[PDB]
Design a protein around this nucleic acid. Structure first.
Ligand code: DCP
Ligand code: CA
Ligand code: CA
Length: 344
DNA sequence: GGCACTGATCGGG
DNA sequence: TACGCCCTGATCAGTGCC
């Protein structure tokens, strides 16, 4: 098999640069402003100049402003980044037997048939692809080219930014050995630690250990997954999957336990979640982010689809029950998730 | 026991 | 210290059933 993985570079920030070339060359930070104050929010992405100063995705905006006070801070414009991505996924399309759009800024392409099976052919194709995206969209990207999906992702990651990473079959068995454990996709930094010290810290190490003492450190799924990787017998197909859920989250104007206060926002979230569903969800979940950023959810799945008007009543019921569960913490952000969709 | 179903928590981009 | 929004599947717990 042959896979071309594609990950757009500092994507949201790079798009703001294509849209405003003055931003290029200088610290730039794309921020999610909660609305609560003029700086409440989280960083979504920073360009590499901003990363040089310590700016990190996920970090609170005021934190970012203490270490990079002269960076440009811009509000997120997700619809524009979504467009950019749609357009690029379309370009990748014509180069792929199959394309699995993994997220807003990355995809896997099975090019086995396209390159007439030849590995080097595919490498050249990876090159032509990086050029097309730069020429057409002025976006730079990192690619990986390996016999499977997981490997293409690993060498791409080691090759950011603007990289063209490559693992040939020849060097697959080697790379898998020299492969550290944390460099593996699908293994949390918690799974890391509790595996890290406790015997395993490299990828060939699961090999020497036995499934028992591992099926309880990470579960059967991850255990078998690592096992297969370690012996180079992993090969999942490139398969595009449809979205299964559609959510909306809002920050409350102020922290509260008062359902009468929260309800209008919850309704607004329901309305906007619904407008994203290409169907009728059979399950609605309510998600409350408490004062301390702890996350509570209550959901309900029916035997039939849920109309929007119905969702309001169910959602208010679920939220009201959540607050019974907690009893003392105010809510900070509220969210709703719609899934188990009856597709049109 | 173990199937079939529902429900809550947690991690990645 | 500081704090958004959105999507995933695994896992485990629970319940009713035969
Ligand atoms: N906590 C996060 C992490 C990521 N994203 C969004 C913005 C990112 O730009 C985009 C892609 O995530 P990446 O991990 O690929 O990060 P970048 O593209 O921004 O940088 P790079 O891939 O060059 O390392 O997803 C986000 O909103 N919030
Ligand atoms: Ca990515
Ligand atoms: Ca990226």
């Amino acid at each position: 098999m042959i896979v071309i993985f594609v990950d757009f570079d500092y994507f949201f920030a790079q798009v703001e640069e294509v849209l405003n070339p003055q931003y290029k060359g200088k610290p730039l930070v794309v921020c999610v402003y909660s609305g609560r104050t003029k700086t409440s929010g989280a960083v979504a992405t920073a360009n590499y100049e901003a990363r040089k100063l310590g700016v990190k995705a996920g970090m609170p905006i005021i934190k970012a402003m203490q270490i990079a006070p002269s960076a440009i801070y811009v509000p997120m414009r997700k619809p524009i980044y979504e467009a950019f991505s749609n357009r690029i996924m379309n370009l990748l399309n014509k180069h792929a037997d199959k394309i699995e759009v993994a997220s807003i800024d990355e995809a896997y392409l099975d090019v086995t048939n396209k390159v007439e099976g030849n590995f080097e052919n595919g490498i050249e194709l990876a090159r032509k692809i990086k050029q097309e995206i730069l020429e057409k969209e002025k976006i730079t990207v990192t690619v990986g080219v390996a016999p499977n999906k997981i490997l293409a992702k690993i060498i791409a990651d080691k090759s950011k930014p603007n990289g063209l990473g490559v693992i040939r079959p020849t060097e697959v068995q080697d790379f898998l050995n020299e492969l550290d454990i944390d460099e593996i996709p699908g293994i949390g930094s918690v799974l890391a630690r509790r595996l890290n010290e406790l015997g395993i810290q490299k990828l060939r190490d699961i090999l020497s250990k036995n499934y028992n003492e591992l099926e309880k450190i990470t579960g059967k799924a991850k255990a078998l997954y690592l096992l297969k990787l370690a012996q180079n017998k992993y090969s999942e197909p490139v398969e595009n999957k449809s979205r299964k859920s559609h959510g909306r989250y809002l920050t409350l104007p102020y922290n509260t336990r008062d359902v009468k206060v929260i309800l209008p926002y919850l309704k607004k979230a329901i309305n906007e979640a619904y407008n994203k569903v290409n169907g009728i969800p059979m399950r609605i979940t309510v998600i409350a982010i408490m004062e301390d950023l702890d996350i509570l959810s209550k959901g309900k799945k029916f035997k039939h689809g849920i109309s929007i008007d119905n969702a309001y009543k169910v959602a208010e019921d679920l939220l009201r029950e959540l607050l019974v569960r907690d009893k003392r913490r105010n809510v900070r952000r509220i969210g709703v998730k719609l899934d188990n969709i009856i597709i049109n």
